[PDB]
Every structure is written in C-alpha cells, then in structure tokens.
Symmetry: C3
Subunit: 294 residues, 3 copies
C-alpha cells in the first residue's frame, strides 16, 4: 500500500495501489464488512403500537427496511431493459475454481423467512404480492415465475427438481388446529399438463369420513362388515370412490343434516368388485352411484 507513479492513472498520474485482490475489508461495529463498496449488514427495528392505517406511506413508516426502485423512460423510447428491484444472487463455489461445496446435511437458502411468534397474535403473513393499476394497462402480470438456464451455457446436471415440497410432521407436530389450501376465486384456470397421484388406503374397520378423506381410494378388506359414516364437517363438492375387493360388505351412513339420495334407495354395495361413488351436493345432498358386482 504505497503511492506510486503508474500509467494506469494517466500519462503521468499517481495512485494508491494496494496490492492484494481482497482490498480493504473495513471494520463495522464488530465485523469485517467486505471491499469498501458495501454498507452495514445487521439491521434491527422496534415499532410503536398504533391503530390500523392501511396506507402505503403508513406501512412505509412502520417498515424496518424500505427498498424502492423507480424507472422513468422517455415517451418516445420506453426502454426494454430488465429492471429488478432486489437482486439476491446466491453463489456456491468461486467462478473458475473447483474447490469445496456443500454436502447433504447442510443446504443453501436463497431467502430464509422465519416467523418468530411467542405472544397472542391474530394473523401473520409470510408474504404478500399487490398490484395497483392506477392509470395504465398492464398486458400480463405473474406472481411467481420459474426460469432454468439453457444447457448451451450451463453444463451442469440437476438430479432432482421440486417446485414445492411439503413434509409430514404427524409425530413431531400436533398443535396445528387445521391446515388447508384455499382458492376462493374460481376465475383462475389450472392448465396442468402433467400427471397426478392420489392417496389410497385399505379399509378394515368402521371409519368417519371428513374433509381429509376427500378423493382417496378405499379397499374394503376383511370379513366383518365395514361402516363408513359421513361426518357433519364434510362439505358439498367433494367425492369419494369405493371398490370392494373382498367378501366383506360395506355399509354407509350420513350425518343428520344430510338426506340420503340414491337410485333405488341402496344403502350398501351389491357385492364384490362393486363400485360406489359418493358425491356431496349443496344443502346436504348425498348421492351414491352404485355399480353391479358383475
């Protein structure tokens, strides 16, 4: 780190020529930040309790970190450049280097959002996506977009890909009152071009159907009769399928608020290999479509 006379600063310029690729790390209130082109790292904030002010300025003044990006092109030349607001670039391994990596026990996270709740709270939001078309027309908006780079530039191989992955914690977690997934606006259309898989189970004891049992396949296996009771929590719209693979018969019952509706008033399957489709319609309309054993 000296002042030298070099041509890189001009025909006869002078410069400070610190001679290490990892130039000044700088010391913040405890940590070496990075090259002297960065800012503070750890941010904390405490908000003051107030009333409901559903305004953008109000939530801005309550926010802990505010990032805003404004683009202003000319009317003659509306630009076509990609303008992200927040760019999080997770990188593993230095470019041009074949050193190290991360193993299975650990994992790298592009963005970790953790909810820390220990006080009585009404609702908590993990994310939110709002669009405000104040003045103009937007041709198309997408909340979540998935892009994978073409193989002509990326020679790597991805063994497995998951769009969305949800584990099971029936043992470790019991305090969840109810977990669901709601789409209250039927305007959307699901253009699912792939396959699908549904749950299946074999019945041997009498069961009470709820909203979770919507749509699986039931196998009546055993010798004693198996009774299925449609609980009051079952909502119109779901459907269940039953097929008998054994000699045991299948009995059906409904909640008092549901009135049985069937062709011929049949309350059980006719025989083995007989199909039974149970469908629920508004104001408690239970319809059981039966198929002959033969």
């Amino acid at each position: 780190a000296t002042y030298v006379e070099t041509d890189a600063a001009g025909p006869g310029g002078r410069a400070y020529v610190v001679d290490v690729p990892k130039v000044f790390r700088r010391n913040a209130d405890g940590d070496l930040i990075e090259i002297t082109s960065d800012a503070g790292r750890v941010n904390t904030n405490i908000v003051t309790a107030t009333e409901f002010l559903p305004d953008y300025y109000a939530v801005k003044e309550n926010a802990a970190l505010v990032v805003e990006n404004v683009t202003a092109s000319f009317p003659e030349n509306p630009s076509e450049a990609v303008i992200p607001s927040v760019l999080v670039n997770t990188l593993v391994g230095a470019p041009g280097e074949t050193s190290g990596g991360n193993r299975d026990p650990g994992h790298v996270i592009g963005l970790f959002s953790e909810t820390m709740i220990e006080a009585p709270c009404g609702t908590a939001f993990g994310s939110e996506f709002r669009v405000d078309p104040r003045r103009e027309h937007l041709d198309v908006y997408v909340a979540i977009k998935h892009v994978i780079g073409p193989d002509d530039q990326n020679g790597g191989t991805i063994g497995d890909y998951i769009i969305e992955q949800f584990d099971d914690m029936r043992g470790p977690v019991q305090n969840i009152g109810s977990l669901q997934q709601n789409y209250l606006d039927p305007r959307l259309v699901t253009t699912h071009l792939g396959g699908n898989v549904v749950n299946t189970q074999q019945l041997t004891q009498n069961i009470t159907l709820t909203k979770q049992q919507s749509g699986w396949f039931f196998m009546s296996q055993g010798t004693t009769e198996i009774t299925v009771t449609l609980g009051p929590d079952v909502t119109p719209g779901c459907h269940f399928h039953f097929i008998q693979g054994s000699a045991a018969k299948i009995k059906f019952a409904v909640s008092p608020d549901k009135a049985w509706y069937a062709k011929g008033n049949q309350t059980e399957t006719d025989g083995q290999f007989g199909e039974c489709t149970i469908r629920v319609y508004p104001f408690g309309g239970t319809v059981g479509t039966f198929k002959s054993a033969a």
Copy 2:
C-alpha cells in the same frame, strides 16, 4: 492498515484491513469523497434504463439492492452448514414476556411486495427463481419449502395454516382481463396426497360454457329445456360433466368452428339421471359420452 490472514476472504486469507468504519479520498478539488457507504432503513434508486440487455452484470447495474453470498471450502473438506443469502425474522413479543400482540385489523407480514403503475408497462414480475448449473452437478433444487417447528421445541399452537390463499374480488375489481395459472411443461409430475373440491352448479336456463366453468359438475333443475352451447373460446382438452336430476331435457350445441361428436349422433340426453360427459379435442373433436337414464 497492514495485511492479515483473516480467513474471512476464503480458506487462504491474506486480505487488507482498515480498522475504522469510514474511509475517504481527497479528489482534485481538495474536499473529501467517501469510498464506503452506509444507508439507513430507507433506500431509493432512480434508473434511466437503456436498451434491452439480458446480462447479469448489466442487470445488477440497475438493481436498487444487490445481495451476494459466496460459500468457499477446501476440495477435500466440503462444507456441511446452512448458508442463507438473506435472513428476515418477524418477531412478535419481546422474549421472556407475553405482553401485547396483534389483533385481526393488523397483520404482521414477513415480506411485503407491491407495485404502483403510472406509465404504460409491458409486463411485471412479482418474483423470479432462476438457476444456472454452470459447471457442476446439483442433486436437488427446491423453489419453496415450508417448515413447521416441531412441538417438542414448540409449546404453542397454530389454529390455522394456509400454504396459499387467494380471495374472491368479484365486486371490488373488474379491470382484470383474465386470471390464469399456467403449467406449459407436461414433463412436470405433480404428486398430491390431500383432498380436492370441485365447484358445482345447478342449471336452469340457457348457458354458454367458457373456460371458467370447465371441470365442474352441473345439475339439471327445473322443467324448461336447458341448452349448453360451447363457444369458440373453449380450448381442446377441457372436460365437463352433466347430470339430469329432473325431467328437463338437455340440448348440446357447438360453435361452427368445431363438429359435435357423440354416440350415434345423439345430440340430447335421454331422460332423468342421463349423465353426459363432454370432452373437447383438437381438430374440433367434441365428444360426448351419454349415460342411460336407467
């Protein structure tokens, strides 16, 4: 000053360190210009975008906040820790105290994303999840991965959990053209294990089927003749189901751009409980499977 083996510049080290959080540089005029930077909790950027350039180095030149996190390890000792590029924590209630909380009117949000529109905009992205396997092999990729704390370490309870909620805004918004959820790659293998609910409708008058009503279960009610007309918008591949629960007949009509197809050119139902399943197919092939009344 001085050069140190900090180990914060990789496994090797050998970086240059300055022991104060602010450094400066004297320009030609004689006044100091800061080399470093430190912004508060509010950040603002204005960009005069040039022509389209899909280069990551060019892309980061327009972002208002760029975050990188590089993981480096020895080739013989790959890392096994967890490396989140960005960590955001939403804490309610000071630890060691249960005082206070948030009711229904106020909702704590881990991450807020929103947009204002004031100029003609082509398209807008609420998020984007890219991946570039530039050189090496990656085993598993996950876009969104939901985690619930185990109850052995969590004495509290969660009454309701929603992995995704989309409300209905029939009244408040009417400027939206279409609502879509596209999966343009049939190579996707969706795996489900929960339940499903299908919207159900009771038909009583003339109806022109569109994209929104696809996949539903329709009920024939009343005595007057009910006609279902398939408009041009109905793309191939959609499926519809109809059940005649009364004596009202059901007629089927197709747009002139496609030809109706059924069993024996039967363009109507046969009677009560005569179910018709309509499946559209390319080249204008609209097939209808008709079920006998008895």
Copy 3:
C-alpha cells in the same frame, strides 16, 4: 494515509483518508482495478462454512443480510396495526406524470432471486418459510397471499393476473433429471374452485405409460392395433382413462413387476366407443374398470 479526526465523518468523528484522487487494487492477474462507489446497496459476504449447526443464532452468522423486527406491544392494549418487516415498493413512472414506460421486451421484478452453481452441491433452496410458535397460540397463518387493489382506488386495467407461471424449455433445457411437485402430508385439504385442464392425445403407435402421462385421455386412431405397456416406473395411486376412438383395438400390457387385473381378464377393448379406467393399487394391483364398445 493515516487515520485522522475530522467532522466530515460526523460530529467529532475519525476516518481513514487517502490523499490521492485515484485508488487502485491489484487483482489476481496483476492488473489494476480502480476502486469506486456505485449507486445502491451492494451488501455482499463470503463465508467459510463450519460444520452443521441447525440453530438460529448460529445460522444468522452466515447471512449476508439480516433484518430484525420486534413488534412489542402493551399487554392491556395489544396493537391492531399492520407491521411488515421488509417492504419492497417497485413502481414505474412518477405520480401525476404519464411520461415514458416499459414495453413488453422489458419487465420489472419485485424480487429477482438467483442461484449460480460452480462447485458440487447437495441441496439448494429457492426460498423457505418457517413458523416457530414457541410459547403462545397463533390463530391463523398464511404462507403466501395474493391481494389486488380494488378498482375504487385504482383506475387502470390489468391484462392477465397469473398466480403461477411455468413455461416449456424442452429445446433449450435437456439436462434436468426430473420435474416434481410433492405433497407427502395427507392432512392437507385443497379447495380449487377454478377450472381444471389436463393433457389429451391420440395414440398412433405402441407406447409405454409413465408418471407424466397419468390422468390423461387417449384415443386410438386408424386400423392397426396399438399396444400400451405400463412401464416399471408406474406406482400405486395413479389412474388412466382410455377410449377406443376408431376400429383399431388397444392392447394392454403390464411389466413383470406389476400384475394385470381386470374383470374377466379383458386385456383389450372390444370395439369403438369402449371405455377403460386403469387404476394402480398397493402391491402392484393394476385393476381396470371396463365398459363395452356400446
């Protein structure tokens, strides 16, 4: 350069000042790179990860950016105010001005996540949402929402509002091992009121069924018989729908691992307008519900 005491770094502050307008760094190749400050926060970090420590305090040490929000409120008067943690406000055009814009080739991204791979890796997460109810009870939690400003506040229009978009990259991308979307907790209940669209195709030669083809509709065209073989990859819980669209019969074959199962061991459709519903059940039970040609 020497540390000095100046007011330019705050009232009664100290700094590290270089007395030359140009400061240079020697990179790994010996070239000189000028050190300069751009616009926007460039928060960056490099981590030499230790062993696996799955603790919040431990993991927070490896984050390039940490945001902490504590909404402590009084016990007798809990708050009812919306309090986000990270607020992102991307907008186009200043309020009150219609000048300029951004056409379709360009776009704005609310949060541009990224992931570059240069070294072998085990697991990568695009994002992660976690809830930790240590002490108290939470009423409702929703991971991700979708809120659109009501028209009484927004005067513009939206063309398309895509909840989730996934394009097709068969050409550019062929190094992907597989594409999946797994839900391995059966307790989940979904309420999809919108339309559902699946993939349909017409057979022309002998084919082998895969997981991607589950839940599709097929028709046989021509005169030569077409053989459909269930591949070894087929697992229990799938379903396939087949209809003979022409005079050519469709023969059914099963891999040695799976066992064929049908009413009367009917391995092919009798004639045109026949129906088959092939469902795979535990222990390799490939059971096919059959409907005759008529």
